[PDB]
Amino acid sequence: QKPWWEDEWEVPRETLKLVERLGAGQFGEVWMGYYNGHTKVAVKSLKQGSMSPDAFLAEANLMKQLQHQRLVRLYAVVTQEPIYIITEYMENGSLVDFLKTPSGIKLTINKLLDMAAQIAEGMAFIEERNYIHRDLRAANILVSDTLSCKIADFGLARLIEDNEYTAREGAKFPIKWTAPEAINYGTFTIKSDVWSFGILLTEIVTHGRIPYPGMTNPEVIQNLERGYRMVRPDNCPEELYQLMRLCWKERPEDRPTFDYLRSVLEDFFTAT
Numbered sequence: 001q002k003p004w005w006e007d008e009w010e011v012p013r014e015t016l017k018l019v020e021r022l023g024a025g026q027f028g029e030v031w032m033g034y035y036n037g038h039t040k041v042a043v044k045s046l047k048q049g050s051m052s053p054d055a056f057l058a059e060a061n062l063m064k065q066l067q068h069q070r071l072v073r074l075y076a077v078v079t080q081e082p083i084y085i086i087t088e089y090m091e092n093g094s095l096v097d098f099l100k101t102p103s104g105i106k107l108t109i110n111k112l113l114d115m116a117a118q119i120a121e122g123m124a125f126i127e128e129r130n131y132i133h134r135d136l137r138a139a140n141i142l143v144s145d146t147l148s149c150k151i152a153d154f155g156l157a158r159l160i161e162d163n164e165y166t167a168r169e170g171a172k173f174p175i176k177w178t179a180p181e182a183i184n185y186g187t188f189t190i191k192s193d194v195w196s197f198g199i200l201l202t203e204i205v206t207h208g209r210i211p212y213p214g215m216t217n218p219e220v221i222q223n224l225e226r227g228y229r230m231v232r233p234d235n236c237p238e239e240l241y242q243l244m245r246l247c248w249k250e251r252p253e254d255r256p257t258f259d260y261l262r263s264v265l266e267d268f269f270t271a272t
């Protein structure tokens, strides 16, 4: 990697003004702020000792390789402690949160499908660049002031050199959003993301409801093994439900590509 004095992303910390905190956690905080006074940005600060600085910055390095309108763009980094990762700011927050606001609640199925396609479009890019996300869920999709969506949180994202990535035996993941093969064997592929996308679609149409209503994780796994899939969400268009089912097919290879998903959702949108 280019040393910081030559890296185009490194910026003097003096260029940043942290204004409002958007999140506080075990490993640090995320603030809304301004770059050189006029440009609104999001600033991720690492909590010293909470985790490795190399681990922290690794997400930024990957984002240098994955630039696209549909993905939250890396803005800059401050690699001298305290460490910051600065990114493009999304005014309407996370999708899971937005869909619960007065504005979000009033969205038509037409606009929900539009957003769904925007998300598949972003994943199609990730798909084509030989990467995987692994944390695809409504909570990790950000919404702009113009109601456009972008993929966020690349913490678990990985460049796939061969067909898959194998996680650590101890690695744990959200059971309801993760593909069977991934939960069982720790094997992740772009097809695992496709399964997650299916779950995300249920989050979209139910305006942020937790998937598999009234079911615990063990119940979800048991039902899946029987061949059952999530029950049709209330008011979920059947065509969308059947698209979801494609994402949840038993064999990873039988699941569709994200480009296919994008194409279909775009047809669903232009039809409504």
Ligand SMILES: COc1cc(Nc2ncnc(-n3c(Nc4ccccc4)nc4ccccc43)n2)cc(OC)c1OC
Binding pocket: 022, 023, 030, 042, 044, 059, 072, 085, 087, 088, 089, 090, 091, 092, 093, 094, 097, 142, 152, 153, 154, 155
């Ligand atoms: C979710 O909640 C919100 C988010 C945002 N806006 C925003 N815009 C860009 N990035 C992040 N943002 C990022 N960006 C991020 C970090 C690393 C890689 C890729 C993207 N990581 C985050 C972790 C925790 C909270 C915000 C984050 N947040 C604005 C909100 O209200 C006005 C809001 O509701 C409070």
